């Protein structure tokens, strides 16, 4: 009976994000001496060079976290993250210039990654 102006009465239950897309768990280390936060929608293979992880497993993927949130890595911190698949056309342009086209081009992405010193390529 107490009135809170504009209040919500939300329905029961939970919202599943990124439903029906493959998920993948990987370990990632911040080998740098400064903190790194990573947003929900950056193509994961194109993150800061000093993050060490299996770069191949970042291709075609992004963090499986609520839209608009970010994972945080303190200097030296190693931790697991869960990834989900990119959707739409599964193309990436710009950001770190590793892809600039289909995410299917795995060898091309890794060759560019390795040449520029993104840690964790084969």
């Amino acid at each position: 009976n107490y009135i809170v102006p504009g209040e919500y009465r939300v329905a029961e239950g939970e919202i599943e994000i990124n439903a029906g897309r493959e998920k993948t768990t990987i370990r990632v280390s911040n080998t740098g001496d400064r903190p790194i936060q990573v947003g929900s929608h950056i193509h994961f293979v194109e993150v800061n060079k000093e993050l060490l992880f299996d770069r191949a497993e970042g291709i075609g993927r992004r963090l499986n976290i609520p839209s608009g949130t970010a994972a945080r890595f303190e200097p030296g911190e190693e931790m697991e993250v869960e990834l989900t698949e990119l959707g739409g056309n599964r193309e990436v342009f710009g950001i770190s210039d590793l892809t600039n086209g289909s995410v299917d081009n795995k060898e091309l992405i890794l060759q560019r990654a390795k040449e520029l010193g993104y840690k964790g390529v084969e």
Binding site: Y8, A11, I15, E16, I17, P66, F93
Partner: protein
Amino acid sequence: MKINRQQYAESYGPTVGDQVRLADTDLWIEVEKDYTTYGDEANFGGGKVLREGMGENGTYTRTENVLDLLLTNALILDYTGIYKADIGVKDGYIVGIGKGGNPDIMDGVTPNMIVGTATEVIAAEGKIVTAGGIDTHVHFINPDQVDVALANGITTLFGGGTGPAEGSKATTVTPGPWNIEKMLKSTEGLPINVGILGKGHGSSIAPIMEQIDAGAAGLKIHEDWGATPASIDRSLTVADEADVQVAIHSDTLNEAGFLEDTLRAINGRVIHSFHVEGAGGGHAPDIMAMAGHPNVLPSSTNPTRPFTVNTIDEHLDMLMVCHHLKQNIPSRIRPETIAAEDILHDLGIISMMSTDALAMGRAGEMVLRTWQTADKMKKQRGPLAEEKNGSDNFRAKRYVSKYTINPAIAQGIAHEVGSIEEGKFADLVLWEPKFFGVKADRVIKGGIIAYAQIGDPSASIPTPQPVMGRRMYGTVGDLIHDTNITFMSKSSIQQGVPAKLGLKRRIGTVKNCRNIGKKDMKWNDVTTDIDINPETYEVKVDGEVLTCEPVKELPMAQRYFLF
């Protein structure tokens, strides 16, 4: 990974099935559907989604399906539905309602709603978004009235007047070619859409028609100019030829005829009946019977809305004042018709609200009183039969229609304004639910913000006190031209009146208002036999007695207002 609903709603705004309270009323609206793809919601800020190569496309030029503006996560309340969507705007129009972002990486993106380099973002998560209000009973008496209207979410003023001249103070009339020209030029400086009514009075065609040709968007028949059978007939002949609307305030005195005489003069033609209840004017005591006819588009003005303990006293007050202006005031102010007017609104028999700004009505309280009325009817009658899920969605759509789509339809301007639909002009109002219908957050005119509740201009951020309504960049310099529409008759546009006067505003064409009726009033389309007892003023609808009582208190009042 799942997000519970409470946290979901506080980050992205509510989703299907969630309900939101309108201000401090007991009305609840429920999200009917949501265009989003869960986990691909758009949002803007540090480490958020609308960033280059991510939710923002880095490839496409502005023509390539890219928006000028995305409102993210809006809860739309409209005659067309109550639902969650992103709203995309381009060239000052709504081009897409759906899901905005980058098809590079996101599923479910509406093809013409790409966020690109050219896109501005307004975050509407947690807000309600409605069409701008369309006020079709405006007296142009004091330019200060425009900000009053904007602050309560009104974006179009239709009416008449030359300022505080007695003609304009009594009637929504800009009389004659020269007054109309002068006010079209004045309009160049008013940050709101405008349409101007000429004097619907004359016994020859030409003195009337020449006002349409000069740029009027419609006519007003008013008793104070002689609401006689001749002026009614000539005005409707003019309107049928020019495709504009006529508004009527009929002969309260019953001097040349009773209500049946006015209907006979109208002769089945379309007409907008102003303040149909009659406190605002019209055949005493039975004008309100107008609202049962299929050719009548019926509006209320706002001071009778809704029926409260002070209503009669203040209207008796208002009648004393008219006597003191010595206006043939020794019947007029009737609790029976004002009470009934509440119920007729609820039943969909009166289709429209309007202000009567500065003549007998309040420029900034059309939207406010619409919701107070809906809330009072829920309290007294309970949920409408048509409701379900425990929401008030049906009543909310019937009421939102009264001040958005229905006035637009009646005026012949619904192709441009009056609803959140693709292809319509981007007149949009953002509301915090806590202020809904009371004080608008941001008023968008033609895709640019025109007015906003915003704080100290010297501060590090815009939220510190004092937060008040202020004109924004849409109103400054030449942008006032591009963000606002002057509505005009087809003949004045064909005859080149805009160029002849130097008008720089967008010119809207009035059309398709001779070929409509009551059935075209969205959610408010009821025709019926209204009986008003000549001796007791008792109101019947199809033989059934209508009865209500006034309330002592309203929501959307003393919790909000400093005076």
